[PDB]
């Protein structure tokens, strides 16, 4: 059946599979186009970039990025690692272009979407790369508002230092489509002042929090873990 997302990841119950090769990330060519406040979240659209290797049948191309956060800095990601929650979550969305005619079509099939999850952890450290996104937020303060990403930004710089990953067959966060998750438990670090700009964005009221509360891992659903 359908496996709703997000979930809690029981690290101890995760099964280790030798068929996982190392994941291969090529965001070197991916430049961002427009940034959008959807009324529910920050979305950053990308032209170019793809992922390959690991358990993937073929290359999946980068479509876009979503940003999530909570009311308080200490608890605002979607997914959880042993009931621990990070400050927020980046969701990098990819789809199966090799196979399908479009993203629109890709959503209709369980091999269509692959969403990489990068955790945001608030420390006492201004993240210079993440700041580029923060600098845009004035332009998209209004709801249903798009604007040109007005700076140089390499998405490669938001990658964790350690790219070991959990993976499971879930859904998109809004349940619109099945999707396969790749979740890096090593987070990237940001400052509290950076995450606070997001809470000043207007909603469809302000977007003070936008994460989805977790779901039961289904009996048949397995969560796999690669040792890098």
């Amino acid at each position: 059946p359908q496996q709703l997302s997000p979930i809690n990841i029981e690290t101890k119950k995760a099964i280790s599979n030798a068929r996982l090769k190392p994941l291969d990330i090529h965001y070197n060519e991916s430049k961002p186009t427009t940034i959008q406040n959807t009324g529910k979240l920050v979305r950053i659209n990308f032209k170019g970039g793809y992922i390959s290797g690991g358990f993937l049948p073929n290359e999946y191309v980068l479509s876009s990025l979503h940003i999530y956060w909570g009311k308080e800095d200490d608890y605002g990601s979607n997914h959880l690692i042993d009931v621990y929650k990070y400050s927020g979550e980046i969701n990098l969305v990819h789809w199966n272009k090799k196979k399908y005619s479009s993203y629109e079509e890709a959503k209709k099939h369980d091999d269509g979407l692959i969403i990489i999850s990068i955790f945001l952890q608030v420390l006492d450290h201004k993240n210079v790369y993440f700041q580029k996104i923060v600098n845009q937020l004035d332009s998209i303060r209004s709801a249903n508002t798009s604007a040109p990403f007005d700076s140089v930004f390499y998405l490669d710089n938001l990658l964790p230092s350690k790219l070991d990953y959990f993976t499971y067959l879930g859904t998109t966060i809004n349940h619109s489509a099945d999707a396969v998750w790749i979740i890096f438990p090593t987070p990237i670090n940001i400052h509290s002042d950076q995450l606070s700009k997001f809470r000043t964005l207007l909603s469809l009221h302000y977007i003070t929090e936008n994460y989805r509360n977790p779901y039961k891992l289904n009996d048949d659903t397995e969560v796999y873990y690669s040792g890098h």
């Epitope: 186009t33 659209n45 209004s142 249903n144 508002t145 798009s146 604007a147």
Partner: antibody, heavy 117, light 104 residues
Framework: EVQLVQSGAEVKKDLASVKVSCKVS????????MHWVQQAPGKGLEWMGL????????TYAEKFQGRVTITADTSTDTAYMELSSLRSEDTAVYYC??????????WGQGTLVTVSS | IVLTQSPGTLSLSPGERATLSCRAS???????LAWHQQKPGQAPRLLIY?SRATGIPDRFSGSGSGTDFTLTISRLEPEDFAVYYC???????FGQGTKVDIKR
């Protein structure tokens, strides 16, 4: 640069469904929102709804709710607008329009749908 | 929700200044109001969102906050005589419209 080419004017009997189209060019369709607006002859503008073409997610004005369906074809770069049960009063000019700073930035030329028996 | 523009219709000559105004029922959150021009038998045109749209000349200028906003055209012209609309965003309700005719 940006061009919005809407379908030609239509004449429809009562209780019929028309499907007005919008053909988009000169920008990335999915990177921006897409709005639809009504203008009855002589009277002013009235916002009908919008669509995110990337995911095809829509929100309509409650006034037009139920009797309207906005869609987006990412393959043909074509937004559509489908009126459900047509009435005399639905006689109007219907504009598709590209969003750019929260609002309809670049407008199309409209489509004069006319309703009569 | 509801916007009402002033006046019903605004009569003036070329060369002088035009002061259009739109007033609202509830606070326009974070002051997100926009002004559209519409000439007859034509598509509307985004003038301002007090932010200038590219293509729109130095003549025009918007301002305001809360529930009182004002479009100002310093130094009128013949092409500027049109129907004008105020839109509230950030929903999407339109002003009932202000017709700018010629003072005879």
């Amino acid at each position: 640069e940006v061009q919005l080419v809407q379908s030609g004017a239509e004449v429809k009997k009562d209780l019929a469904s028309v499907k007005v189209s919008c053909k988009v060019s000169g920008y990335t369709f999915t990177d921006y929102y897409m709005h639809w607006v009504q203008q009855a002859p002589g009277k002013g503008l009235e916002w009908m709804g919008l669509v995110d073409p990337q995911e095809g997610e829509t929100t309509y004005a409650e006034k037009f709710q139920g009797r309207v369906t906005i869609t987006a074809d990412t393959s043909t770069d074509t937004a559509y607008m489908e009126l459900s049960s047509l009435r005399s009063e639905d006689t109007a000019v219907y504009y598709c329009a590209k969003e750019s700073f929260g609002i309809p930035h670049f407008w199309g030329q409209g489509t004069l749908v006319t309703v009569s028996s | 929700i509801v916007l009402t523009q002033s006046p019903g219709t605004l009569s003036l000559s070329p060369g002088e200044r035009a002061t259009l105004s739109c007033r609202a029922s509830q606070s326009v959150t974070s002051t997100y109001l926009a002004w559209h021009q519409q000439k007859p038998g034509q598509a509307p045109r985004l003038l301002i969102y007090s932010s200038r749209a590219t293509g729109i000349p130095d003549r025009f200028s918007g301002s305001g906050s809360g529930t009182d906003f004002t479009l100002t055209i310093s130094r009128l012209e013949p092409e500027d005589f049109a129907v004008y609309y105020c839109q509230q965003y950030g929903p999407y309700t339109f002003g009932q419209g202000t017709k700018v005719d010629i003072k005879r």
